Amino acid sequence: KSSKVVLSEPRVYAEAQEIADHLKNRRAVVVNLQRIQHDQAKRIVDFLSGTVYAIGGDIQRIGSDIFLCTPDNVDVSGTI
Template sequence: MGSVRKASAWLGLVEDNDERYYDDEYAEGAESDDTWKTDPRARVASQAVPEDRRIATVSPDGFRDARHIGELFRAGTPVIMNLTAMEPSDAKRVVDFAAGLAFGLRGSIERVATRVFLLTPADTEIVSGDPAGRAQDGFFNQS
């Protein structure tokens, strides 16, 4: 079917014969089965997230939620603890627990913001986005 005929059928000026539309190069080498074939040049990204690329975010209500933090960290998952909703005394207990957990499993604990902490396992590297490491004459220098 020519391009003028295709356009006319799309606009509704002529009756469409329910034919499949093919470009000339595909019409010559068309396969007999009607299965959809993916272009071999196209790459489909995997939807599954590898285990080593997960980060857990936990906002505990009390010290009783510390066990969940410990189980995640023991499994090798980095954990962000948001303690802003907790009472100060319970938050201190959770931080002490997390510090002991990080020490015992050779991980690290880092304060991210006020009452927000990051627990990282031993095999995880933290890359800082600190502006102190940038060159002074960089792109964003406004002086």
């Protein structure tokens, strides 16, 4: 179905909101939280976690402090 990926590196809540908007449009987003403050990373994940669930999607770890956010239109499998 939806085969579009956004590669983003958010720092703040406002930028996390943009990711949510991308998710609302049923896109896949890669969320790199490696180069930001721990507190910032957590707040972003918690926010996005609510989003992906609201739209029937999910959020999974794909690397060290990196998460993948997709709708239910993406068959995400495997584990890291």
